[PDB]
Amino acid sequence: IIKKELGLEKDDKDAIEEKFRERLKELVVPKHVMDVVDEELSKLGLLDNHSSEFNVTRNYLD
Amino acid sequence: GAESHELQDVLEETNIPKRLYKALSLLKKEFELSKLQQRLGREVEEKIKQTHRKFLLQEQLKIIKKELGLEKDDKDAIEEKFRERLKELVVPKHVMDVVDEELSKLGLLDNHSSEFNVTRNYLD
Amino acid sequence: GAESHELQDVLEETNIPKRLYKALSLLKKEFELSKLQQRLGREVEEKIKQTHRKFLLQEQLKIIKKELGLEKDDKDAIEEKFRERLKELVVPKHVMDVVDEELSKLGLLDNHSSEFNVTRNYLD
Amino acid sequence: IIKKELGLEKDDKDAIEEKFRERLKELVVPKHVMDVVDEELSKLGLLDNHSSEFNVTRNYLD
Amino acid sequence: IIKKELGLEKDDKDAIEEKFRERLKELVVPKHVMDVVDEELSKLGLLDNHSSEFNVTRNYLD
Amino acid sequence: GVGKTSIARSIARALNREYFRFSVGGMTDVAEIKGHRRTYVGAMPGKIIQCLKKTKTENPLI
Amino acid sequence: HLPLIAITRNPVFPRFIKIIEVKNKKLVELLRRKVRLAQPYVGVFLKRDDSNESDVVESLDEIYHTGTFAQIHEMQDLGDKLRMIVMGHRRVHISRQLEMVEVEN
Ligand SMILES: Nc1ncnc2c1ncn2[C@@H]1O[C@H](COP(=O)(O)OP(=O)(O)O)[C@@H](O)[C@H]1O
């Protein structure tokens, strides 16, 4: 019941997450780099779009 | 609700059908006016109700959090990351308190400044 | 809204009274579930309405006295306070128009605003 | 009527205004901080108990 | 229908815009700064005096 | 003027791999190889990473 | 004796119209094959816990023996290629779905 509260297509966020994920699907990704990407994406999800930390994170992730 | 000018124009119409059709025109004008008035008032009231429901559901979203999303602050996340990273380490107490001081400054500095970036790099 | 396994059980029930009673029990269970879902938001609404009721009581005790229970906040009096604090000075004109603009902003700006606080300090 | 209505909703925050005020009573204290604390407490009452900025203001008062 | 009851029209008057306009009316202005000030006045109108950006914009206008 | 660069291009095309040149003459900054720290906003990675990005393969002709 | 219909979280209550839609195109061949029949019909069944399409294509034990035989109503194909229409006309409970022999119990 908690989760089902204002779905709105889950607010249509974190599309850059899946964009980069698809970007990595074709590549054979070493384990260390992949875990780093997972951590960085986890940080991305928690960060607001405006913060310069978020911008640097996204630039590095790309 | 026709003004004095429209009523004078109608009174200047001697032909009964013509004045009747002009009165129909005035009636239709007032019809559209009142219809738009009521539609706009209803639009306003539904939008205010939607605002109140948006507040309700923003509280319900805060419930959704359960320590998710905004509750991390994007900096205490760095706190937790560093602490877990050095947890497995048998870390010296001196550098432990230095890391504590660095984290305290991290909390004492904004997320959108150069000195904060330098602090983050040094703690990295 | 009974689960698939509940329908499986009802189908495996081969006695008419058994299946009917089991269906009724499922009905009451799922009604309880859905009504709880509604009740959570309804109670959020109740909380907001109670809080705004208490805020309205506070508003009643604030406006009824009309400052006959408290005293004038003097925030508007800041205008005249500063002006008399300046009235006696033979002064150029550009500074007067700047002062008037700052005073107008003060009138517009809310009391609690940080913009308002900086405006107050600058005018001091 | 004024007095009783004030008493009904006396406190701006639960046992905050009274405690801080009496705490100040035993302090021979300059006029400036009296006016400042009066302004802060007025805006405190204008604010809600749980507002985060209200909590920061209360921290400042403490 | 726009002009029915606007108590807010009195405050944040458009008078400053006309003041600047007349101020520059007696001068042979470049079209460049003319369009620039049109854009700036439009932005200021969509902005509120309470905004600090409003004040910075007004200083640039000056 | 012996075609060293030209023969480099010829090898790149004949092997079917990609090509990318680089000037280091009179250069004194290590950053271009090791990039920047990723911390200074506007920091850039090493030129080699950029070449990998452009060729999009790890068997280029650098 | 047609392959079991993939319910895919589309319960079909007896005597209650329902619409089943499946992403995989395999059911397209099955639907097109039965059109030639003068009286097209389709069985309806219920899945068990631990839903899995892979198990459906591997084993038939996943689908409950209980089901609801009925008639295919009409083809729509508005935006998708599969808008199966299932109704509850005749309840059935297969004695042994391994082996199609079915008794309208
Ligand atoms: N043997 C050769 N075959 C083809 N082209 C040549 C030859 N020798 C020189 N050149 C030409 O001379 C040009 C000199 O290019 P340059 O970049 O100066 O080469 P290098 O780096 O060896 O000096 C090349 O564009 C190349 O086409």
Swiss-Prot record, chain F:
ATP binds at G1, V2, G3, K4, T5. Changing K4R: Abolishes ATPase activity, and presumably ATP-driven protein unfolding, but does not block access to the proteolytic active site or prevent a substrate from binding to it. It is found in: Mitochondrion matrix. It comes from the Eukaryota. Duodenum, heart, lung and liver, but not thymus. Homohexamer. Organized in a ring with a central cavity. The ATP-binding and proteolytic domains (AP-domain) form a hexameric chamber, while the N-terminal domain is arranged as a trimer of dimers. DNA and RNA binding is stimulated by substrate and inhibited by ATP binding. Interacts with TWNK and mitochondrial DNA polymerase subunit POLG. Belongs to the peptidase S16 family. ATP-dependent serine protease that mediates the selective degradation of misfolded, unassembled or oxidatively damaged polypeptides as well as certain short-lived regulatory proteins in the mitochondrial matrix. Endogenous substrates include mitochondrial steroidogenic acute regulatory (StAR) protein, DELE1, helicase Twinkle (TWNK) and the large ribosomal subunit protein MRPL32/bL32m. MRPL32/bL32m is protected from degradation by LONP1 when it is bound to a nucleic acid (RNA), but TWNK is not. May also have a chaperone function in the assembly of inner membrane protein complexes. It is linked to CODAS syndrome: A rare syndrome characterized by the combination of cerebral, ocular, dental, auricular, and skeletal features. These include developmental delay, craniofacial anomalies, cataracts, ptosis, median nasal groove, delayed tooth eruption, hearing loss, short stature, delayed epiphyseal ossification, metaphyseal hip dysplasia, and vertebral coronal clefts. The Lon N-terminal domains are crucial for the overall structure of the protein, maintaining it in a conformation allowing its proper functioning. This is Lon protease homolog, mitochondrial. It comes from Homo sapiens. The chain holds residues 526 to 587 of 959 of the full protein.
UniProtKB/Swiss-Prot annotation, chain G:
Duodenum, heart, lung and liver, but not thymus. It comes from the Eukaryota. It is found in: Mitochondrion matrix. Signal peptide: none annotated. Homohexamer. Organized in a ring with a central cavity. The ATP-binding and proteolytic domains (AP-domain) form a hexameric chamber, while the N-terminal domain is arranged as a trimer of dimers. DNA and RNA binding is stimulated by substrate and inhibited by ATP binding. Interacts with TWNK and mitochondrial DNA polymerase subunit POLG. The Lon N-terminal domains are crucial for the overall structure of the protein, maintaining it in a conformation allowing its proper functioning. The AP-domain (ATP-binding and proteolytic domains) has a closed-ring conformation in the presence of AMP-PNP and its N-terminal entry gate appears closed. Upon ADP binding, it switches to a lock-washer conformation and its N-terminal gate opens. It is linked to CODAS syndrome: A rare syndrome characterized by the combination of cerebral, ocular, dental, auricular, and skeletal features. These include developmental delay, craniofacial anomalies, cataracts, ptosis, median nasal groove, delayed tooth eruption, hearing loss, short stature, delayed epiphyseal ossification, metaphyseal hip dysplasia, and vertebral coronal clefts. ATP-dependent serine protease that mediates the selective degradation of misfolded, unassembled or oxidatively damaged polypeptides as well as certain short-lived regulatory proteins in the mitochondrial matrix. Endogenous substrates include mitochondrial steroidogenic acute regulatory (StAR) protein, DELE1, helicase Twinkle (TWNK) and the large ribosomal subunit protein MRPL32/bL32m. MRPL32/bL32m is protected from degradation by LONP1 when it is bound to a nucleic acid (RNA), but TWNK is not. May also have a chaperone function in the assembly of inner membrane protein complexes. Belongs to the peptidase S16 family. This is Lon protease homolog, mitochondrial. It comes from Homo sapiens (Human). The lineage of its organism: Eukaryota, Metazoa, Chordata, Craniata, Vertebrata. The chain holds residues 123 to 277 of 959 of the full protein.
